[PDB]
Design a protein around this motif. Structure first.
Motif, PDB file in Angstrom:
ATOM      1  N   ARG A   8      10.180   1.214  -4.801  1.00  0.00           N
ATOM      2  CA  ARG A   8       9.109   2.176  -5.023  1.00  0.00           C
ATOM      3  C   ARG A   8       9.430   3.525  -4.384  1.00  0.00           C
ATOM      4  O   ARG A   8       8.644   4.467  -4.424  1.00  0.00           O
ATOM      5  N   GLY A   9      10.621   3.688  -3.850  1.00  0.00           N
ATOM      6  CA  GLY A   9      11.074   4.967  -3.313  1.00  0.00           C
ATOM      7  C   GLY A   9      10.712   5.188  -1.870  1.00  0.00           C
ATOM      8  O   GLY A   9      10.992   6.282  -1.353  1.00  0.00           O
ATOM      9  N   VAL A  10      10.180   4.197  -1.190  1.00  0.00           N
ATOM     10  CA  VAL A  10       9.828   4.413   0.238  1.00  0.00           C
ATOM     11  C   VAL A  10      11.062   4.194   1.161  1.00  0.00           C
ATOM     12  O   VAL A  10      11.782   3.211   0.873  1.00  0.00           O
ATOM     13  N   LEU A  11      11.292   5.067   2.121  1.00  0.00           N
ATOM     14  CA  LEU A  11      12.361   4.834   3.126  1.00  0.00           C
ATOM     15  C   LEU A  11      11.624   4.057   4.240  1.00  0.00           C
ATOM     16  O   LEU A  11      10.715   4.639   4.841  1.00  0.00           O
ATOM     17  N   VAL A  12      12.025   2.827   4.492  1.00  0.00           N
ATOM     18  CA  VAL A  12      11.417   1.969   5.548  1.00  0.00           C
ATOM     19  C   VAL A  12      12.246   2.127   6.848  1.00  0.00           C
ATOM     20  O   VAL A  12      13.442   1.808   6.805  1.00  0.00           O
ATOM     21  N   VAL A  13      11.694   2.617   7.906  1.00  0.00           N
ATOM     22  CA  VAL A  13      12.298   2.853   9.225  1.00  0.00           C
ATOM     23  C   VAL A  13      11.690   1.876  10.224  1.00  0.00           C
ATOM     24  O   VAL A  13      10.443   1.917  10.358  1.00  0.00           O
ATOM     25  N   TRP A  22       0.847  -1.175   0.000  1.00  0.00           N
ATOM     26  CA  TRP A  22       0.000   0.000   0.000  1.00  0.00           C
ATOM     27  C   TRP A  22       0.895   1.241   0.000  1.00  0.00           C
ATOM     28  O   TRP A  22       0.679   2.170  -0.779  1.00  0.00           O
ATOM     29  N   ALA A  23       1.885   1.334   0.872  1.00  0.00           N
ATOM     30  CA  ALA A  23       2.766   2.499   0.971  1.00  0.00           C
ATOM     31  C   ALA A  23       3.445   2.785  -0.372  1.00  0.00           C
ATOM     32  O   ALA A  23       3.498   3.925  -0.873  1.00  0.00           O
ATOM     33  N   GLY A  24       3.992   1.753  -1.001  1.00  0.00           N
ATOM     34  CA  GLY A  24       4.712   1.861  -2.278  1.00  0.00           C
ATOM     35  C   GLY A  24       3.722   2.180  -3.392  1.00  0.00           C
ATOM     36  O   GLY A  24       4.103   2.965  -4.267  1.00  0.00           O
ATOM     37  N   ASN A  25       2.492   1.691  -3.346  1.00  0.00           N
ATOM     38  CA  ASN A  25       1.468   1.961  -4.371  1.00  0.00           C
ATOM     39  C   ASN A  25       0.906   3.373  -4.233  1.00  0.00           C
ATOM     40  O   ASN A  25       0.402   3.956  -5.239  1.00  0.00           O
ATOM     41  N   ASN A  26       0.960   3.987  -3.046  1.00  0.00           N
ATOM     42  CA  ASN A  26       0.382   5.334  -2.845  1.00  0.00           C
ATOM     43  C   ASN A  26       1.390   6.463  -2.753  1.00  0.00           C
ATOM     44  O   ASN A  26       1.003   7.530  -2.268  1.00  0.00           O
ATOM     45  N   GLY A  27       2.630   6.229  -3.142  1.00  0.00           N
ATOM     46  CA  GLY A  27       3.713   7.186  -3.206  1.00  0.00           C
ATOM     47  C   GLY A  27       4.119   7.827  -1.881  1.00  0.00           C
ATOM     48  O   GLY A  27       4.452   9.005  -1.858  1.00  0.00           O
TER      49      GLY A  27
END
Ligand SMILES: [Ca+2]
Ligand SMILES: [Ca+2]
Length: 269
Positions: free
Chosen positions: A143-148, A111-116
């Motif tokens: 998808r450009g998400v920084l995962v913390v 969801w995070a990667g699909n919703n920018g």
């Protein structure tokens, strides 16, 4: 009257806010128990992957607390987040009980990667690896998400999954003395540390509560990532992650602290 929690001051967020950096235009997803409507929060959207809790509202309190550390509004009440203008999304992957299935967590990342989303906050973890989780972490990352993610609260010399994974930025907890909190997991894969003891934040029922954990440390770093992103709109997840580590204050051993204490003043210089 608004108060500034010690952790916020510790990571030097106000220094950044005074340069005009507040996380404006950065989308941050909180993958947790939900986010309750609260006067000191601005919830833009989200989704629930918990069957039986279709709503994104928080029946636990954890998600609401984590959300306020990232983005409690800068105004005349409550507290103040590290990135008070960040666009907050409530991604429910854990139930009221505070636990969830791996598949819900992987769906939240998808969801995070699909919703920018620019940043995904995962204040959760397990001692066991997961092929499904791993693949989700990697997919959100490309998808450009920084995962913390939180390192875990067992106080052992090995960190939890997903924080252990190469594409996850692993966060441990420090106390008021700038020492590692006794419960903070450390070891291989640890990237950085942030305040995690006695952290006051937003809480369901329109109040404020203080908690302890690597879960409290994580949001300080998610918030610091939004500040850097606002300042450097062209940077990738990787560039932000390296910058945060590069500008952290060394606290002693990298086995115990990774890069050191996150520093939003130094990172936004
Ligand atoms: Ca406030
Ligand atoms: Ca890691």
């Amino acid at each position: 009257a608004q108060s500034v929690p010690w952790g916020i001051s510790r990571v030097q967020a106000p220094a950044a806010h005074n340069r005009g950096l507040t996380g404006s235009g950065v989308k941050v997803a909180v993958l947790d128990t939900g986010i309750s409507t609260h006067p000191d929060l601005n919830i833009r959207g989200g989704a629930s992957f918990v069957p039986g809790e279709p709503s994104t509202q928080d029946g636990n309190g954890h998600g609401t607390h984590v959300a306020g550390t990232i983005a409690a509004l800068d105004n005349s009440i409550g507290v103040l987040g590290v990135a008070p203008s960040a666009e907050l999304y409530a991604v429910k992957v854990l139930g009221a009980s505070g636990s969830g299935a791996i598949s819900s967590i992987a769906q939240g990342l998808e969801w995070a990667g699909n919703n920018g989303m620019h940043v995904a906050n995962l204040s959760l973890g397990s001692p066991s690896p997961s092929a499904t989780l791993e693949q989700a972490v990697n997919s959100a990352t490309s998808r450009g998400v920084l995962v913390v993610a939180a390192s875990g609260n067992e106080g052992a010399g090995s960190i939890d999954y997903p924080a252990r994974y190469a594409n996850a930025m692993a966060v441990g907890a420090t106390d008021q003395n700038n020492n590692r909190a006794s419960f903070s997991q450390y070891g291989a894969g640890l990237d950085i540390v942030a305040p995690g003891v006695n952290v006051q934040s937003t809480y369901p029922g329109s109040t404020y509560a203080s908690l302890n954990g690597t879960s409290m440390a994580t949001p300080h770093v998610a918030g610091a990532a939004a500040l850097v992103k606002q300042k450097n709109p062209s940077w990738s997840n990787v560039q932000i992650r390296n910058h945060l580590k590069n500008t952290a204050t060394s606290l002693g051993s990298t086995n115990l602290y990774g890069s050191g204490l996150v520093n939003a003043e130094a990172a936004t210089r």
